[PDB]
Each structure stands twice: as C-alpha cells, then as structure tokens.
C-alpha cells in the first residue's frame, strides 16, 4: 500500500547509533581490539597505570594486559546459565631493587564480562543492562550561602569516592574557614603549609579590601611551613602521634596524591576553565622538591573573595545546569569497580611481599586476583545500576539502554531528593527528554537520553545544531554542551527557509534557553529537528504537538509494555522513526552486502553475496524473553530474490516488514456504550478474537533439582508413590513430561521422589498401611507440578545430570530439569490496552459482532472508546489520529506524519474528501440511495450546526465525513445513533498487564517461619496483606468480629485457624479465637531485651498465655 509522508522539514543528519551510549562506552573501556602499545590511558588501562608500580626492596610493575576470546558463545552462555566473558591476563615484571633480579610473568586475573552487539550483558545466564548514572560533575562551584546574604560557599567536589569535599566560607567572625570531613579551621593554616608568605597573600588578595584581613593571623604566620604542617595534622587528627613523616603521608594522600585524590578529567577542565588557570594534574596540590606546592586553593580563594566583594565576572553556578551534571556510562561505572578491586589486590600483593621468601617469588605467587574478581562480580550481579534487561518487546531494550538514572551507588536516595533535581532544567533541551519519566515516586530521577543526544568523552550530554552565518543555513552540524550553547542565539527548527536562506522577517530563537524574537541577522545556529528535543519513545507518538504532556508521558512509557502479537502490524499513522528503531534494535535481520537469496526456511535463510561466498543466517524461533514474551523472527524473503546491502531478510518480534509493530490497527467508534466503557474501560468486538488480533505467545520456565541429601538421593523418576497411570500418562520413561503435551494446573511436569523425613512412619500411618497391606514406601512424591492458574503446551525440556559431558552442577545437585511451557493468549476481559497518546483501559466487555455498532454498508467497528476520556485528559492527538485513520481505511493507505511537522487539518480534510468518494460514490453506482435513518441523523445533525441546511443528503453526509463523523447503526435495535459518531482507525497495543497473571486467591496455605502469618505474593500462594489502613477501615465500620477474624482465625492464631477449618468442613460455625502467635513472639522478644511483660486479669493476677509451656 501507499505510504504518504507529510512535513517540509529536511533533517540534515540521521539519528545517531541509538545504543552508542552503551557500545561505545564499553568498547573504549576495554580497548580489547587495540594492540597494547596503542592503547590510550583510559578505562582498565588507566586503572592499571594507577595501581602500579606497587613499591616495597621488592617492586612489582605493570607491563600490559590482554583479553582472550570468550570460552563460550553468547547463545551458549544463556543456555548454561554462564556469564559471557573473556579471560583477563596481565604481564607483570617483579624487580628486586637490591639484587637487580627480574622475574617476569603473565598472571591470570580472572574473567571480565563482554557486552553483546546490542549493548547488553549476559550475567549468570540472564540478560542485563547497565544504566547510565547522572550526577554532579567534579569541579569547583560557588553557591550563595542561604543563611547570610552577600556571602558565598566555595565547594570543591571530586569524583565520587576519589576524595573529600571542601567548603570555603567566610565566617561571621571574619576568618575564612575550610571544611573537610565536617571539621572547620582557619584556612590560613592550610595556606601556610603550601609555603605561602604574608607578602604573597597580601599582594594577591589585597585588591579586596576588608576580606584579606580575615586571612591574616599572626599566630599562624609565626610557625614555619614545617611547624604549620604538624600543627594542622594535630587539628585534623586528634591522638594519632603527629610524626613528621606521618603527617606528610596523611595530608599528601588527602590533597596531592593522584592515587587517593582524583578530580575527573572533566573535573580538571572545569576547574581550569572556571578559575582561569591550568592544572598540572588531577590533584589539589603537589609534592615537589620535598615540600608542598599549591595548585587549586589560591585560585579558588581568589575567586571566592572577588565574588563576596561583588567584583564583576564572578558568578554563582547553577548546579542543575547540564554543564555541571554529567553521565557516568557503562565503561566508567565498571572501570570504577575494576579500580576498587585493583586497589584491594594491591593490599594482598604488598602484604605478600613481606611474609614470603625474599628469594623465590614470581608474579604468580605474589598476586591474588580474588579481590579483583569479586569487585567485578559484585558490580554485575548486585549493583543497582545493573538491571534485569527489559525485553518485553524490542523497543523495551532500546529504551532501557538509553535510560539515565540519578539513583544508585554514589547518587541520590529516593526520600532525600527535593524538587530541584527532579525538575526539567532549561538545559535539558535537546539532551534529556522532558516527557519520558516515571509517573510514580521516581518522577524526575529516571529520565531518557534524547534522540539526537550523544555523550562526549568528558561525560556531558551534547545536542546538534546547524550553523547559520549571515542568514544561510549550512549543512555543518556542531555538537554543543549546555555551557557552550548558552553563548549563542539558536533559531527554531521550523523557521521558514527558501533554499538555505532564512525567509522570515522575525524568527523564533533561544538565548540561554529564553525564547526571543530576533532578526535573521542575529541568528547564529538552528535546531537540527523537533525530534532532538524528545526521547525515542516520545518521538513515536504522532500528533504529539496536540497532546498534553501528562498524557504523552503515559503514552511513551506504555509502548515499552507492548506485547509482541502474532499478527502485529505497524500503526497506520507513523512518525517516521519506526523503521530506525527496529534496525538499531537488532531484533530484525538485514543483508550484509548485495546478493541473491539462496534458501528460505522457517529456521534459516541462505544468501549468496558478491564475493561468491555463501553466508547462512539462522533465525531465532520462539525464544523466551526475560518477561516471558515470545521473541521470534520470521523470514520475509523468498528463494531467488535479489537483495541489496541492508535489505530486510527476517522480521523480528513486534515488527512488520521492518517497521515497529507494537499493536494492531483497529476500527474504533468514540461513543458511550451502556456503561461498559465507563471510567476508561473498553468494549471490544468478538471479531478481534476470531481473526486472532491481540493474540500473543507466552512461555514460562519451570525448574527442578534432584540433589544428594543426608537422608539419601532425590531421584527424578516416573515411579511416584500412589499415582494412577492417568496421572503419569504424559510422562516419559525417565519421568519428564513429553514435548507437545498439554499441561493444566495440578499436572506433573517432572516426577521426583524424596526420602521421607527421619520421623516419617507415624504410628497412625503404620496401622493404616497395615490394614490395606501396602508397605509404606521409603520415598515421598516431591514432583514438580503446574501451579494454580498456569499451564499450556510443553515446547521444550532440558535435562542435565552429573557425570555427563560438558556439565558440572553446583555442589550436591545430581540433576536439573527445565520445562518450557507455552501458551497462546487470546485477548480477554481484564487485559489492558493502550494507545500512544496515554489512553489506557482494561477490556470490560466482548460483544458478539451483531451487537457492535456498524456503518450503513454493514462493517462493524472493532473497539468502542468512551469520549469522556478525552476532555479531562486533553490528549487530542488520538482524535486527529482517528480522523486520518478513517481516510486511510477507505483509501487503503498509511501515513508518516512527523512530530511538530505533521499533517495539518486542511491536508487531513482533503484525504477525507477523497475517502468519502470511495465510501459513498461506490454506493450510488451500486443502485442504493440515502437511507431513512441517515435522514433522521442528518436532521439531528443539522439541529447541531454540523451540516449546512438545504444541501442534499449526499452533500451533508460529506460535510460530516470531513469532520470525521459517520452515521452509525446500533446492531441491537437497527435504529441509528441519534447523532453522527467519530469513527476511524486507531493504533492500540495490548500491554503486559494481563488478568491471567494477576488473578489469585487463597483459602489456607504456607505460613512464615517466625510470625506464622500467611506468606505473600501469588507465587507462594500467599494471602493478601490486611495492613494498618485496612484495620482502620474495619474499625471505622465498627466491625469488631470481622476485624478479630483477620487478626486471629485468618492469620497467625494457630489453634484458632486449625479449629476454624475443621469447623467449616463439619458445617459448624467458627469457634471463638485464641492468642495470636505473633503476640507471643513479641512477648519473648521483649524478654530477650530484659523487659518483663505480664498479662493480668482484673485482679492484677498473672494470666499465662503460654499455658504452662515456658515456666518451670
């Protein structure tokens, strides 16, 4: 079909590689493909250079590292619950400074996880994403002192964990104080340690009249730099003997040591630029020629005084400005943990270079890599920034990799965050999306990288702009940081152009984010596109300019939750980004070079290239994602087809011919329906199920271990005590359910026996067994069964024993069986649907086709959406989307309407007119005239001012069709709806929240160990939590016995809950409750605290709630 694209904006550059923030960060960090001599000092390399050489006369030096090849490919790691990783080795030379002896060896440091092609990791078999972390850039900032006006605080901030923060203040007493680790002292003392004299300080700061005297302290000047260093050490470190070598070591490590104190590389540049100096390194001072030599402090002190006096050119810094906030990407975070483990490894090395043999030592004997392996293993498994990959659909993972978190180690906590950080800063323009953020507690903490944004080497987000010189728009694009952007006047991307020339007398531009009207002579740059302001998810919302931001937010976020549908289609109204998302996602498969297709299968595609070489592409079929949606690729080409470089070969999941397909295009009527549409609920036609729209495949993994016990081995067997052949029917000889079997709740998946607890033969069971004459078996039935509410078709079984090639399990485990069960899920009542504009609702009613509202020519609608959802939400894009969708339904076409440069109303009306000709002119030739009911509707419509009175019925119907309204017949009555109704094609997705997953109920079940209260959650067969607020509700109702049940018979009252069950199965009423067991726990816990808790009667005599059991 035709695809008609609107908009006049020509984008000079395409979107960058969308996962480059991940892929490029880690590639730069490992530098695996660089030959060692050519590596720059960055990532792991920089870490090695930092840790080495490791001194005492033994000295160990670092030569170079190398990364091997992965022991197992990616697919294999996922299968075997392995980390996809490479062996890391380091060439080290041991030197004896006394002897000269040199032993050199390459020591094995363990493995490092490798990133896959799409920017994710495989850690213990599961796919994970490392989320970038936003934080305050290192540097020197000046903020106003909130308590005392006209005063300022100078804050020197290094990288997290790479040094202390310093605060410079001018105290009310007049002396300038320095704050380090919460202690204050006169800054003059520290200045004296650097070798400063009254002359130098007088000439430097003298310019500021009254302030320099606060620096002057006679007593401090009396002591020489040596005396001042010992004095300061005694101020900062009470008790510790102030040995001169000891003091230098401490202060050196605190200030001048590049190993213990690291400003960023971004920290260094920001300091150099702010104070107008050049730093020789990343430390606040140096140790040179035996003494301390200042670097930062005097320039920082100079700027602070100049600001307090109000000298022009000294400013406070906006700390939420995106010039002072930078991103720590995968490479930086991992390298940080690498550096920690490396420092720990050095402790072991130095400790081993004393207690060992001074003669026989290799580098292999000296180095223990366990600390290093643990730091990396800790980061990847347990870090907060290492997250279980979101792969519900391909857009999910692309979005996850492009996410920015302000949380995690070294960042904000969630309760400790006020408005300022969560705000949308003016500098977010083009860098962080203003729309895509969580609606809940995390709003503003979790954000998304903008579509055209890229992170530079220093970690600042940059966005592209086109240069405009004289008035001509060049094609040269400049990526700017927020700080540099503030210098220029930047015109909007839609400003009219004839050729490359600006065609308007007054243009809309920004100066430091402030919008201003300006002459073309004043225009320095221009936006690349509208797209650059928003995230990838937001850019997928057509007519976004017509949607209130609060609803666009939900629209963005919910596309992440879209389930891959077996019939999935791309939307009839696209934004033009839907091809790029699939291609960068790597879900879909494309041709490497030009060639001809040799073979096409469900499982594989063979392509013959220009070289003559025959390349085979295997296809991923029905694989289970982290969230249990089916990822499967389908071949879109045929044998003998000539393909070009980059032509589509196979469609990934949730893609249609290479376009992102998150849902279906359905025919919707906007109208109330008998209250089944009420309060965002949705009414749908049974026709959707009939043609398998909104049907999705889901796979669940079940697992069971057979292990060695002290009571004897668990065995996975088909021989299970007391089971009929009916119960075992679908189990094979070995006890595993057969592939292709249908399993329902209660069915056995894997048969397993466990040796009976050592108490086991109860005397009651002994007599019972004796009566029937069946020996009580030694083992009990522990078989894995289908949980309540689950089940499907068995598509896979994996069995792994001990002692079979290639497999070694965790200690004690004989064998592991995994069963993959698939289900085809038809849309049903309670499943959740949404569109891209933030309209979301649960399916409340499925009507038979004869009840569905229908057009005069007999076509029934698919979905009925209530109009009451539009006006309060103010998301009108869905309305425009429906109108253009109506034209396309009859014209047989789809559209690309870009965001903010889109199809406008007049253009949509033209298409609607051409459509009416097809919807109506066809009929007039077929020998049918206007309907009687169409006449009644036209009458009511002319009473509403929709149609012009006096025109023919055909003319009036067309007037309504240009308004997107049609005559609609109620399938129940046959009578029309008394008014014309908005009908068109809408793109609607079936989201990840499905009633099948959430429906849960419990009579009785598992209880917790200490509290004896029911466990939580559906997976444990838990009970619902009746919490503090629920009790209040029962209290306010005065329902004392209902509440008492919740607190006793229905929870941790053991005698009570036991007695209640027996009563109910006997038809008796439930008995009076007893003491809740968790109160007894409370009493004993208070006794453990040496508090005597006594229950008393009205006579103040003790009442024993333990019934004699705890008293002698």
């Amino acid at each position: 079909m035709e695809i008609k694209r609107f908009g006049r904006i020509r984008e000079v550059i395409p979107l960058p590689p969308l996962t480059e923030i991940q892929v490029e960060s880690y590639r730069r960090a490992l530098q695996a493909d660089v030959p060692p001599e050519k590596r720059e000092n960055v990532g792991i390399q920089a870490a090695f250079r930092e840790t080495f050489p490791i001194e005492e006369g033994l000295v160990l030096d670092f030569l170079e590292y190398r990364l091997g090849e992965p022991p197992f490919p990616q697919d294999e790691c996922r299968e075997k619950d392995l980390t996809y990783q490479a062996p890391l080795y380091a060439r080290l030379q041991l030197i004896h400074k006394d002897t000269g002896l040199i032993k050199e060896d390459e020591v094995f440091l363990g493995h490092i996880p490798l990133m896959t092609e799409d920017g994710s990791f495989i850690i213990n078999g599961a796919d994970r994403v490392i989320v970038s972390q936003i934080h305050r850039s290192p540097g020197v900032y000046f903020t106003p002192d909130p308590a005392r006006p006209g005063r300022y605080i100078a804050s020197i901030i290094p990288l997290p964990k790479r040094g202390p923060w310093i605060d410079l203040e001018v105290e009310p007493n007049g002396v300038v104080s320095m704050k380090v680790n919460k202690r204050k002292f006169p800054l003059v003392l520290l200045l004296r340690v650097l070798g400063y004299d009254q002359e130098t300080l007088a000439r430097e700061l003298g310019a500021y009249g009254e302030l320099v005297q606060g620096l002057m302290d006679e007593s401090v000047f009396a002591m020489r730099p040596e005396e001042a260093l010992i004095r300061l050490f005694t101020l900062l470190r009470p008790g510790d003997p102030p040995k001169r070598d000891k003091a230098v070591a401490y202060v050196y490590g605190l200030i001048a040591d590049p190993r213990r104190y690291d400003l960023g590389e971004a920290g260094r540049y920001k300091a150099e630029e702010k104070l107008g100096i050049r730093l020789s390194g990343r430390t606040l001072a140096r140790f040179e020629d035996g003494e301390f030599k200042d670097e930062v402090f005097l320039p920082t002190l100079r700027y602070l005084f100049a600001l307090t006096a109000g000298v022009p050119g000294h400013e406070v810094d906006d700390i939420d400005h995106l010039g002072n906030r930078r991103i720590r990407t995968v490479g930086e975070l991992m390298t940080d943990q690498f550096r920690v483990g490396l420092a720990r490894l050095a402790r072991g090395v130095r400790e081993r270079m004393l207690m060992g043999s001074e003669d026989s030592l290799t580098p292999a004997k000296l180095v223990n890599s366990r600390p290093l392996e643990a730091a990396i293993r800790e980061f990847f498994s347990r870090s907060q920034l290492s997250q279980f990959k979101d792969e519900t659909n391909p857009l999910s993972s692309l979005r996850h990799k492009r996410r920015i978190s302000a949380l995690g180690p070294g960042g904000l906590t969630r309760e400790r965050a006020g408005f300022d950080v969560r705000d949308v800063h003016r500098t977010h323009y083009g860098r962080i999306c203003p729309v895509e953020t969580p609606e809940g507690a995390n709003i503003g903490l979790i954000t998304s990288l903008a579509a055209y944004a890229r992170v530079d080497e220093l970690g600042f987000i940059r966005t592209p702009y086109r240069r405009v010189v004289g008035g001509v728009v060049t094609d040269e694009v400049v990526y700017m940081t927020a700080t540099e952007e503030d210098r220029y006047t930047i015109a909007q991307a839609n400003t009219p152009l004839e050729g490359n020339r600006i065609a308007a007398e007054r243009v809309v531009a920004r100066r430091k984010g402030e919008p201003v009207i300006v002459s073309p002579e004043e225009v320095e740059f221009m936006d690349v596109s509208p797209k650059q302001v928003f995230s990838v998810n937001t850019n997928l919302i057509p007519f976004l300019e017509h949607d209130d931001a609060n609803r666009a937010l939900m629209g963005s976020n919910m596309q992440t939750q879209a389930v891959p549908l077996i019939r999935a289609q791309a939307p009839v109204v696209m934004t033009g980004l839907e091809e790029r998302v699939v291609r960068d996602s790597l879900a879909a498969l494309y041709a490497e070079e030009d060639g001809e297709v040799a073979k096409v299968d469900g499982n594989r595609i063979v392509v013959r290239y220009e070289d003559g070489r025959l390349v085979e592409y295997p296809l991923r079929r029905f694989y289970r994602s982290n969230q249990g949606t089916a990822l499967d690729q389908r071949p879109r080409v045929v044998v003998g087809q000539r393909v070009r470089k980059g032509d589509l070969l196979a469609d990934g999941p949730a893609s249609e011919n290479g376009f992102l397909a998150l849902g279906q295009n359905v025919l919707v009527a906007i109208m109330p329906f008998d209250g089944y549409n009420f309060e965002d609920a949705i009414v749908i036609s049974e026709e959707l199920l009939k043609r398998d729209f909104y049907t999705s495949i889901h796979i669940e993994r079940y697992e069971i271990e057979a292990r060695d016990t002290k009571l004897g081995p668990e065995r996975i067997t088909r021989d299970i005590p007391h089971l009929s052949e009916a119960a075992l029917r679908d189990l094979d000889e070995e006890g595993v359910v057969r592939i292709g079997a249908e399993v329902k709740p209660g069915d056995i998946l894997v048969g397993r026996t466990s040796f009976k607890g050592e108490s086991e033969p109860t005397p009651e069971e002994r007599l019972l067994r004796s009566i029937f004459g069946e020996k009580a078996r030694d083992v009990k039935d522990t078989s894995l069964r289908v949980p309540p509410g689950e089940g499907g078709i068995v598509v896979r079984t994996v069995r792994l024993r001990r002692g079979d090639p290639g497999v070694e399990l965790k200690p004690g485990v004989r064998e592991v069986v995994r069963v993959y069960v698939a289900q085809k899920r038809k849309l049903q009542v309670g499943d959740k649907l949404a569109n891209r504009h933030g309209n979301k609702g649960v399916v409340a009613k499925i009507l038979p086709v004869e009840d569905m509202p229908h057009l005069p020519d007999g076509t029934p609608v698919d979905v009925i959406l209530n109009p009451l959802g539009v006006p309060s939400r103010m998301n009108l894009g869905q309305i425009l989307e429906t109108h253009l969708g109506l034209a396309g339904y009859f014209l047989g076409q789809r559209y690309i309407s870009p965001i903010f440069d889109g199809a406008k109303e007049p253009e949509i009306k033209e298409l609607l007119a051409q459509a009416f000709e097809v919807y109506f002119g066809k009929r007039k030739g077929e020998g049918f005239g206007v309907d009687k009911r169409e006449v009644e509707v036209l009458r009511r419509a002319e009473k509403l001012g929709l149609v012009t009175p006096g025109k023919t019925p055909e003319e009036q119907l067309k007037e309504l069709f240009l308004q997107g309204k049609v005559v609609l017949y109620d399938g129940r009555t046959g009578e029309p709806i008394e008014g014309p109704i908005v009908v068109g094609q809408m793109f609607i997705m079936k989201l990840y929240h499905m009633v099948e997953d959430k429906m849960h109920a419990r009579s009785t079940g598992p209880y917790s160990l200490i509290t004896q209260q029911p466990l939580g959650g559906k997976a444990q067969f838990g009970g619902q939590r009746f919490g503090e607020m629920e009790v209040w509700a029962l209290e306010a109702y005065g329902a004392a016995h209902t509440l008492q049940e919740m607190l006793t018979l229905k929870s941790d009252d053991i005698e009570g809950r036991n007695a209640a069950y027996e009563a109910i199965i006997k038809g008796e009423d439930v008995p009076e409750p007893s003491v809740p067991e968790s109160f007894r726990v409370l009493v004993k816990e208070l006794q453990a605290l040496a508090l005597d808790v006594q229950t008393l009667d009205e006579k103040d005599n003790p009442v024993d709630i333990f019934e004699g059991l705890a008293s002698k």
């Binding site: 200690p811 917790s1008 939580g1016």
Partner: protein, 85 residues
C-alpha cells in the same frame, strides 16, 4: 569465623582445596572442574570427594538479606514453615 563451626583440621583441608583450585585456575585460564582438583590434591582424592568437601564448606545466608524492591522485604519472608502443620 563460621556460624556453623567446623573442626580446625577440616578447615585446613578446605583452605588447601581453595589454594589448590586457585593455583589450578591460574595455570588453566578458567575455573577447574571437580576432577582437576582431585588430581592436584594427590592420592585419596577423586571428583566426588572434592564436591563433598565443598558442600560442607558452604556458609549460611542471612534470613534478613534484602530482596529487591527497596528496603521493603526480607529473604526469610519467602520461606514456608514445614514443621507446624
């Protein structure tokens, strides 16, 4: 050092197994199997015995270990009670 106390001599064997396995991993460029450790340990050691030794050496984990979410759930809360009926 252990919540479950181990005889001093048995701790010596466990530590020997660690040193041995760590050496083996440093020459082999990967973690050794149970069988490779049994060779390195000399006579008397087969793969089964290396596994049994590792099982005894496992330290318990806290019931108070946090479970995802936020600071909202404990590991012990997900453990059913099999003793009380």
């Amino acid at each position: 050092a252990r919540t479950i106390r181990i005889p001093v001599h048995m701790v010596e064997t466990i530590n020997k197994l660690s040193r041995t396995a760590r050496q083996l991993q440093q020459e082999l460029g990967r973690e050794p199997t149970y069988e490779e450790i049994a060779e390195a340990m000399g006579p008397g050691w087969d793969a089964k015995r290396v596994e049994e030794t590792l099982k005894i050496a496992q330290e318990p984990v806290s019931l108070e270990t946090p479970i995802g979410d936020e600071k909202d759930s404990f590991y012990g809360d997900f453990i059913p009670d099999e003793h009380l009926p």
